[PDB]
Amino acid sequence: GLMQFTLPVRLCKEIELFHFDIGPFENMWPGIFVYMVHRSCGTSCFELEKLCRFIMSVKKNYRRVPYHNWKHAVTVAHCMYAILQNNHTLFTDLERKGLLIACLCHDLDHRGFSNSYLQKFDHPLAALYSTSTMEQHHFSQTVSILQLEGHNIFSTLSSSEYEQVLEIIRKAIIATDLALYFGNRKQLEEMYQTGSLNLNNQSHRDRVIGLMMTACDLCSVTKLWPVTKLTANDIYAEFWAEGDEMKKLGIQPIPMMDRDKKDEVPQGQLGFYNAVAIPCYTTLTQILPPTEPLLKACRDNLSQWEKVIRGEETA
Numbered sequence: 001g002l003m004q005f006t007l008p009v010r011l012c013k014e015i016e017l018f019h020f021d022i023g024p025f026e027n028m029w030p031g032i033f034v035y036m037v038h039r040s041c042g043t044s045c046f047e048l049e050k051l052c053r054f055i056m057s058v059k060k061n062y063r064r065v066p067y068h069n070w071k072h073a074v075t076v077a078h079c080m081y082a083i084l085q086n087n088h089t090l091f092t093d094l095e096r097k098g099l100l101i102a103c104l105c106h107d108l109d110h111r112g113f114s115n116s117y118l119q120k121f122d123h124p125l126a127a128l129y130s131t132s133t134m135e136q137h138h139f140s141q142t143v144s145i146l147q148l149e150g151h152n153i154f155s156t157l158s159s160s161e162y163e164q165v166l167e168i169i170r171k172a173i174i175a176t177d178l179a180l181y182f183g184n185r186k187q188l189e190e191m192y193q194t195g196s197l198n199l200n201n202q203s204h205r206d207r208v209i210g211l212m213m214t215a216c217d218l219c220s221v222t223k224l225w226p227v228t229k230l231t232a233n234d235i236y237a238e239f240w241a242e243g244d245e246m247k248k249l250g251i252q253p254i255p256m257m258d259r260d261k262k263d264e265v266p267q268g269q270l271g272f273y274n275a276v277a278i279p280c281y282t283t284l285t286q287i288l289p290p291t292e293p294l295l296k297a298c299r300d301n302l303s304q305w306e307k308v309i310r311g312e313e314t315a
């Protein structure tokens, strides 16, 4: 504990804000992650040497894709850090540990293609895992890395505690399958509006963590507009490449994956904010009131996409 991690003054202050952008210097991202772990968990949560070796193996198993890349992993992890820091009484020792690692690992070995494309392509992973195909692969990749020599960051846990934290990580990574989000948020909403929601109930906790994982995964819609707009180019770079691959299989891609429909992106975004993002951050704010700034930044970006649609802003 005599060797503490420190950030430059601007980063030290701004990393506490939900809308923090981790910057273009990839060599700083491991330091930013260790810093976040030491502050949300404790400097005794992990042996720094094992953690650093784990981080560099995770980085190596992210691919050079426009969006689902190492920078997305650290960005999702930072959103989870901001949630946990502003709700520090609500989560256990194992949960803080497990959720930051789950976020870092949540898209391991992503090739830029959705579960739908893997099913249509008849990819081997689709035979192995019929539902949440990519997400079950991301978890499998996480377990493989945890089992490399010198990479067991959980080595000081009991067998039972180790099993608990791997279960937290598995459920958290599976929760990032957006197909599961619709069901999960509806259940949470009904539970909140009937006053049945109980954070002491493990099945209830699992759902709240699932929604937190969705909120963290979508957190590009909660950045300052210039970040949100530039990130949309990377997201669509992947969608359109998948749409190209759907056309190569003789299948019409859905409109968001068709690069010929580029002029309808602003209306597509508006659609996504109304059906997915706003409801997500609304339900999260109901359950965890200090996450309000995610909802506020989402509503501000919704207003920016509307300004694009009315031609008061270009994209």
Ligand SMILES: Cc1nn(C)c(C(=O)Nc2ccn3cc(-c4ccccc4)nc3n2)c1Cl
Residues within 6 Å of the ligand: 178, 217, 218, 219, 220, 221, 235, 255, 256, 257, 261, 262, 264, 265, 267, 268, 269, 271, 272
């Ligand atoms: C962050 C983030 N993480 N995800 C998974 C998303 C996303 O899923 N975004 C979406 C959804 C639905 N869309 C529809 C259209 C669209 C485009 C052109 C013509 C017609 C429709 N664009 C869309 N984008 C965003 Cl954002």
Ligand SMILES: [Mg+2]
Residues within 6 Å of the ligand: 068
């Ligand atoms: Mg994704």
Ligand SMILES: [Zn+2]
Residues within 6 Å of the ligand: 106, 107, 134, 176, 177
């Ligand atoms: Zn994913």
Ligand SMILES: [Zn+2]
Residues within 6 Å of the ligand: 072, 076, 106, 107, 176, 217
């Ligand atoms: Zn993701």
